[PDB]
Amino acid sequence: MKVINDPIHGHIELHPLLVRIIDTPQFQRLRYIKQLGGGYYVFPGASHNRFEHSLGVGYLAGCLVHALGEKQPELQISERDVLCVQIAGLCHDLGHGPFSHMFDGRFIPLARPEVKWTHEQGSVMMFEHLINSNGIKPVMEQYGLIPEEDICFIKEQIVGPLWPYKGRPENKSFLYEIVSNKRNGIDVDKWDYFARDCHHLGIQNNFDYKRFIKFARVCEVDNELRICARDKEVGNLYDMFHTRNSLHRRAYQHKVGNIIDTMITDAFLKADDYIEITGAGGKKYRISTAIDDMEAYTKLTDNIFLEILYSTDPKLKDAREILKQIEYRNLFKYVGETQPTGQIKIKREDYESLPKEVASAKPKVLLDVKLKAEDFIVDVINMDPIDHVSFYCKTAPNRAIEQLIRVYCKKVDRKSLYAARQYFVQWCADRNFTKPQD
Amino acid sequence: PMKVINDPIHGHIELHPLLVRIIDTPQFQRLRYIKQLGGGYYVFPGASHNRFEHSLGVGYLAGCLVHALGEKQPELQISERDVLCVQIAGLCHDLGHGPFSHMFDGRFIPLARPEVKWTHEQGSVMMFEHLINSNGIKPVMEQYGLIPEEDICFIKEQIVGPLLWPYKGRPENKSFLYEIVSNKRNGIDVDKWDYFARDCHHLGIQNNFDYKRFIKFARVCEVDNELRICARDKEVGNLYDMFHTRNSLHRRAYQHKVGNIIDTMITDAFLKADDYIEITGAGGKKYRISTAIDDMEAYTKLTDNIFLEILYSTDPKLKDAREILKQIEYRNLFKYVGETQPTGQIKIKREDYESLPKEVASAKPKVLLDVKLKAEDFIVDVINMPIDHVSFYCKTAPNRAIEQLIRVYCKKVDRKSLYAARQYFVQWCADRNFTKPQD
Amino acid sequence: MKVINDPIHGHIELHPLLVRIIDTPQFQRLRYIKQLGGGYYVFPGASHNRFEHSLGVGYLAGCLVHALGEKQPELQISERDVLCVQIAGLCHDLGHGPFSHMFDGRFIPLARPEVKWTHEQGSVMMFEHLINSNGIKPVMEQYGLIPEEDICFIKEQIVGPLWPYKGRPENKSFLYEIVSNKRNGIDVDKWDYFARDCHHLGIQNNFDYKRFIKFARVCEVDNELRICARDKEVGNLYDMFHTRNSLHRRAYQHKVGNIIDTMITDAFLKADDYIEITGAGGKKYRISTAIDDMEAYTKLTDNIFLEILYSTDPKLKDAREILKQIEYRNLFKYVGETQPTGQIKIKREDYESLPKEVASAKPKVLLDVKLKAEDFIVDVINMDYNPIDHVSFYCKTAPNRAIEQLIRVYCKKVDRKSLYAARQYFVQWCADRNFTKPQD
Amino acid sequence: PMKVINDPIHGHIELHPLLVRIIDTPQFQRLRYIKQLGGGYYVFPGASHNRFEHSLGVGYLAGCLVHALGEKQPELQISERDVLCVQIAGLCHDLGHGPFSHMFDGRFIPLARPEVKWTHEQGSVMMFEHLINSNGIKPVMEQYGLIPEEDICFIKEQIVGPLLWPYKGRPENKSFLYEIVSNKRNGIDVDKWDYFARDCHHLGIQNNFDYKRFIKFARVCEVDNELRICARDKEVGNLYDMFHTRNSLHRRAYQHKVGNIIDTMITDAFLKADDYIEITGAGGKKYRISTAIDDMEAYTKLTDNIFLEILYSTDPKLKDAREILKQIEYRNLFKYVGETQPTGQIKIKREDYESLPKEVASAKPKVLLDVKLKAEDFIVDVINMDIDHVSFYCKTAPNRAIEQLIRVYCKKVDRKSLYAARQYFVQWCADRNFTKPQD
Ligand SMILES: Nc1nc2c(ncn2[C@@H]2O[C@H](COP(=O)(O)OP(=O)(O)OP(=O)(O)O)[C@@H](O)[C@H]2O)c(=O)[nH]1
Ligand SMILES: Nc1nc2c(ncn2[C@@H]2O[C@H](COP(=O)(O)OP(=O)(O)OP(=O)(O)O)[C@@H](O)[C@H]2O)c(=O)[nH]1
Ligand SMILES: Nc1nc2c(ncn2[C@@H]2O[C@H](COP(=O)(O)OP(=O)(O)OP(=O)(O)O)[C@@H](O)[C@H]2O)c(=O)[nH]1
Ligand SMILES: Nc1nc2c(ncn2[C@@H]2O[C@H](COP(=O)(O)OP(=O)(O)OP(=O)(O)O)[C@@H](O)[C@H]2O)c(=O)[nH]1
Ligand SMILES: [Fe+3]
Ligand SMILES: [Fe+3]
Ligand SMILES: [Fe+3]
Ligand SMILES: [Fe+3]
């Protein structure tokens, strides 16, 4: 029964089971993986990692359940239910890779285009590895959990259904909207990293989750059980959503922030063949295939960045040279942005091909310089109002009331940069993407 | 052409292009990979911040203060040359920190090479000379009005002190400029300001000191015909809030019991790994962790990275060290035996840190005990550390002015062995004449 | 330089000029006038008076002005302007009478239908009395105020134009939206008693004025200069308006709260002839006429309730009997509520006549008992004002430019047959007055 | 039929109809016209609250606690009759307070009638009996199961104490019920809880004590085989913060310097007016302010109202008193001379308050001074203050348990007379052997 002090949430009381899950290598791994990935090289305050964030989500998961259980004893929320939601929140991010969203969103699609991989697949594999490597399942039983039944439940809360849910019956469906919510984008995962990311980026977060948790209730909608907010709390809700918008516009879509991310992945790609990560049975993996074995994956952290940078191996001199360019601030240069409006969206599978298409656009008038596909970086940003949440009133508590595409150039001179803007504008034309602004 | 960096504690920070030129180097970005609070992060989840953002802030506050004194008092003859120099000093005062900051020069080097006198402040000066040579900064200095010979002296001296008026970099009439970045006398400098605001911010402690206010009311005045930086009498209230902050950070965070236990565990791994880990320095030569300080090129490559190189290593030579770091991940820590302080004005010197376990373990405690422990089973932790010396002035007359702790840990966790450790220690305290350890 | 500790605003720093206005009898008057009138008899937490509310307004006025002056120097806002806005905030309630709104809203319309009286007229008369009785004008100039021009500005901030304004040029119009705002219902006066009234009533006030003040800016709107808010702060504004709505629904329109107000007024009416208030030149005034002399008005406070209650005077036995009714809790009984929807609103001038009308409605079928006009109390409750649309905004990208009546009737007769009789008359009176049909 | 009142501090308060019958009387509603902190309101604008809302809260808390003890411990034989009585007691414990609360019996009556022994708790008992007699409560008591003879005794005893086991109202096996409303020994009762919460709320002070929690873990247990109310050991953390609230209210509010000066000014006005004011009592007789305590019917009409009655007066017999209250409005207060304490454990008795200025004025203070002051120029303010003495229990074995300040003010405000006042006072402290005044 430890008490941890967190700068956003204050004191976080931790169930001994939770403590047993937290003091394992598969969880301490999150201490070495930046929350905002390449954010830190643009935002100096953003040194924070997945680890404390996982702590906060786990805490927020629990605050909400225990709250719903107290205001409404008829939901039959058990001490068993609160522990699983707490464990799920804690481990939803077990599967993040080097520099978080950079890894499953850009590196694996470029490194192994055929493979379908998400960090949510990654978390469940890592959670399974965690409870097996550390004999967690006996300790679950010691505190009243049913390992077969509850381990499924935690997994389904993280990666979704593997009525589709086997972990809990539908009269407890609302337990599935606590940690991550597909429908109205309101979950304790957002709350923590909304509060957390503003705190480190120097943005003001006026959203008050304690207030929202206090007035939160389960209510019936289309004969479905959902979590609802009372009508007074729409003012708080506009402040939640305005923060989500500021974080995206100001932080998550930052131009240099995202340019630098593609430089890092270009380094990991040129370095993928020459770095070995040690797995099970002593087998050796590459950076891109360590996702295939969880003990190697345990060992795949932000560390790999510095390992490349400090390397003396001549085989890694290319990968090294790109990371020296991040340190010297000689970055890739911005060419332009465009959108596939009205058009079919670019799929993760087709990322590898895009620079070849850009370099192949025929931009007549003819140009002084010619560029090959290796001089182009094509960066796909996927985006994934108030009205879509469901409310209630005190009188009737029973009843309910994109893709951006950016192109960077590795060549830094004005004559070549001009050329790049020309190819780029042509490629947009004959792909029927929107016309780039000047 | 100014770069503007957004910082959570100081906001928008405008950076002179010269400052930028210095920042975008490996000798500086190296600070992105060094925890401000070392092993603190393993006790306070918020303490993930590194020396890097802190170095930006000091550089900023330095400039803020100099520029402020210069505008209010033009007779001080503070130049753009002078301001730039003070700023670089803030920027580069932490260039020399080692893996996990103070754990490194404060415990590791004293335990690994007792013969050596090494400080991060010496290190900051070597790294700074190394920085400006490797990156052709001296032409860039000359371009913005710096005289490299004279001014490079000034920056080093603001960092490491005099290398009679001991300073060769600036005359005594500009003496006050040596009090901005690092103030030896009253411990009030813009560097403390940054890491008090910054360390409170990440730890969730309330900090009531308002430096913007303190800077706004700061003046140079004559005290014993020496020029010092002074505060208005009204602002003695703001000063007390700084010191209540210095005191709660020390009690609550930097002297935290598990925090300092974990430091020594980390340091025990670095010691047990020092011989089998190689860092490539200049001229291709190879250095060890403890001797990499002898070359700034190897030293550049020595960051928090080394904790994970040890943890992820498969080398069978490193298993002994690796196991201490795996202990930390599993949370089986060294055990607290007790705390004491050395009475009188005597303080244990850094050179004698290595001997301390030999002394504690050799103490003869009577009654004789069930177990006898070797010195290798003891960790001795030396933990080191108010208007007086501050100068004030009044609005009417602006020209003129008005510890060590020792904790001992046992590596053996068994109750019989733990009981033994407490006895040796209580004895050791006795005829070293340290104070009696309490229950 | 004084500092006052207040439970809603923390520390309130007061300019010595302000303290000089406060330490006078005309201002200390407000310590003895309940903010919520008959509220205290329904809400035990509601003991707060005009005195602390006025302080808060004065403080909040200054907070807003100083904010605008520091973020936007081109407005040319002086320390003189700040003092004037503060004094105006401070003295905007000098003219409230016994139990505040009961007095200018119901007693004077029943005691003297002929007269036009508002507490806003009252504030100016009393403010004029204050600065004259305490030799304030010499002290005003001591701190840089121009007595002639600035006393105008202050009166005008309270009671309106006496471009219509003589106190400040049109390039400083926005200074007229701080203390009281006719247009968008956003001012520092409502800000105070929204927080202050919730604090004492046990209601949650989520509105953060500090946050709103930090992002407030002056902008050009239709070639008009007004106070605007950043688009971000609509979330905060929604919570302000919800508070305004709860205070009105739950507190200011409380059914028993309003019954008790009409009783106190019934007692003041029956006592008006027999109570004498000493004015200037020693003349003696009545409750209804002390408003005609500001020296007598000063001594007219909530005190008068207890003077009636403690009386042994047989002339006041009638009044005394009603104040005994309130305390034994034998109150007037609720008969019903209705609205003048679609019809002309009942004017203050016509309040006196209404019970005669209600008692004259022919409620056929005939009833076992008959009621006289003296057995009816009709209470006209006015609440003059998406409201969120009438606010003006800006975004950081374009900082230069901008983006009812209730009628209740109570009966004094408390038996079931008479109450039933009463409902019939009331339901009829609504019928041939074309007011809404009363609900069950 | 249960009425429910919303309280800003305690939320919804459900009132037994019997309780409502008692509240809606003149003797009780009298408390709507008596400030809780009296003259405090003239120093703290938030402090406008009266005894009335406080009495409701005590009544609410009394029932809350009695009901909880009964639910966890059915063996205590706590009846619906017992609970009603404790509640009425909480409600009516403050029935006897006079104009401006503690100012009245603590200073006005001791100075106006030095011979008489009067406390408000005595007053509460008389007012309570007048209450049930004049308003026919005893038939209503019998209707809800109270036995008027036995229980009216019990209610009085909870208020003024015993009039060997001294209590006739309830047997010793129900002794603990006497510790709820007012607890003489360990200063922990629900009366204190209420005005600690309420006084914080209106003063803007932070109150960390959680009564709801403390109530949840309270139990009756045997202490020296005597029955006492106990707290669970784990929850002592809650107790320390109760006492910390008691400490801040006293340091920051109740012993406030100008607040207490003002109270003696009000008292000086009541004294200069005691003779010319008539309050009509029973049998038509006329009483003075100081003797209205002799008749409960007169006392009923004596509230804060007497203050404005004096101030608004045009009567010239009352012109002297009027001027002291006119001083208050213009803020020309009495001036502070100094503070002292009675060294030794001796306290100045209320009976001797009147003479205190006579002693001060006759002190021969050589050095001889330019001016001499008479006793009419001195105000002597006696300020009275009324953690381990609490009884605890453990979850495993629940059945069994584990000052005065004196201030002096001067009415003459000039520099020359004020200096004299300090000397007379310093001397008086000397030859009364009280401690040396500071500053
Ligand atoms: N267990 C654990 N605690 C952490 C961690 N990070 C921060 N903490 C906090 O740091 C403090 C020290 O951690 P512990 O290893 O549990 O030290 P301890 O509380 O003395 O543990 P015991 O040896 O069981 O007494 C705790 O109070 C936690 O609040 C972590 O990763 N694991
Ligand atoms: N130069 C530099 N900027 C940093 C660093 N860390 C954070 N930043 C911030 O991140 C922003 C990223 O911009 P830059 O890296 O300078 O790229 P840029 O804006 O194209 O710079 P220019 O090409 O000179 O215009 C900077 O303006 C800084 O505010 C750093 O280490 N070096
Ligand atoms: N002047 C004044 N102060 C008030 C009033 N209401 C509350 N206060 C506060 O209560 C205390 C009143 O004491 P003052 O006489 O005004 O100030 P003081 O320090 O006691 O006396 P001086 O400063 O010497 O005149 C102060 O702390 C004020 O903050 C008021 O109506 N007038
Ligand atoms: N009885 C009583 N209620 C009060 C008092 N102060 C506030 N209240 C609250 O104010 C409400 C209004 O008073 P009521 O007692 O209901 O008056 P009423 O409705 O005319 O009387 P009933 O119809 O018999 O209930 C009460 O229900 C209480 O919740 C008080 O002093 N006495
Ligand atoms: Fe997450
Ligand atoms: Fe530093
Ligand atoms: Fe107002
Ligand atoms: Fe009390």
Author numbering:
A (entry chain B): 115 to 276, 285 to 506, 514 to 530, 547 to 583
B (entry chain D): 114 to 276, 284 to 505, 514 to 530, 547 to 583
C (entry chain A): 115 to 276, 285 to 507, 513 to 530, 547 to 583
D (entry chain C): 114 to 276, 284 to 506, 515 to 530, 547 to 583
Quote the study on this structure.
To ascertain if a differential preference for G-based nucleotides in the allosteric site exists, two further structures were determined, one with dGTP included in the crystallisation of an active site mutant SAMHD1(115–583, R164A) and the other with GTP and the nucleotide analogue inhibitor 2′,3′-didehydro-2′,3′-dideoxythymidine (d4T) included in the crystallisation of a SAMHD1(115–626) construct. SAMHD1(115–626) was crystallised in the presence of both GTP and d4T. The asymmetric unit again comprises four SAMHD1(115–626) molecules arranged as two dimers but with only a minimal contact between one pair of adjacent α13 helices. In this structure, GTP occupies AL1 and again the active site is empty. The electron density that nucleotides were built into is presented in S6 Fig. The G base in all three structures makes the same hydrogen bonds with D137, Q142 and R145 of one monomer along with a stacking interaction with R451' of the opposing monomer. The basic side chains of K116 and R451' also make equivalent electrostatic interactions with the triphosphate of the bound nucleotide illustrating that the binding mode for each of the guanine nucleotides is broadly conserved.
